[PDB]
Design a protein around this ligand. Sequence first.
Ligand code: ZN
Length: 316
Amino acid sequence: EQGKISYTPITHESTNTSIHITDLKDSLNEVQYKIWRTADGKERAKSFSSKEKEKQFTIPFDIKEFEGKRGEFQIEATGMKEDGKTIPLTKSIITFEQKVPVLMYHAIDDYHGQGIKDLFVSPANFEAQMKHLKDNGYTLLTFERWGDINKVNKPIFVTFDDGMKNNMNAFRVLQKLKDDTFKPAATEYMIVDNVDVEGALSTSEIKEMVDSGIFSVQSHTATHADLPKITNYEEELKGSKEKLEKITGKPVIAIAYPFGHVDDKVVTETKKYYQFATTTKPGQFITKGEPDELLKMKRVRIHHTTTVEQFASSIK
Ligand SMILES: [Zn+2]
């Protein structure tokens, strides 16, 4: 191989770059760049040609060429020599960060006054919302697959706060929609000291959820503590993690801050035991390389009266 692909640096806001190639030994009348998204696969590659040696075979690359789809792009360069032969040159990777909606659900039930109205999404609505994700080719992830957000199409994280029994309704809907094409996954943030108490998930229910492969069960602290206000951080953060890990049989790496209450101190303590933390601040996540950004993740709130159309717009 003879290589060194170079491109102009990008940020999370970039939509274009300039790609050229240097350190060539052979003389070429043409170089082809084959470019494809890892999520789509080699079969959906698009090709670009440059016959300009003096400009180091520069090409403009813009994601409008892929209908504004972002993520990881693989670049494969080949050249045609002066003797008619086509040779391999080199390969490279460029990654346009994609946005990641993190959905916040709480209770999945019809409302009978059994809590905060806005926190209840009906089974019919929930099914409609999940079917919209299925039909439009969203890839439902959990935090164990964080490394894949730029390698899949339309990544999204469905999350549930508290560990309510009615989240078994969500489990049944997700099971029912599963098939060869659609592999649902979701994250449940459990109040760990509520395991096996009335109205909360039992140990056997949690185990069924995890064993199915659909749910990743993660921390919501031990007692749903107001984190900025307490000092028993080891107990609420590390203790909830460890207790929950023996229930699930799988690592606990994520937390949701109760009440959405967080400050610099809470982040400092959380970082000792968790890799990912979600707030209740509205918005979609994108990787910017800001300090501790994985521990201050925004979420998209779904409301009692949210229609599929409102839902769809909130995640685009
Ligand atoms: Zn909560």
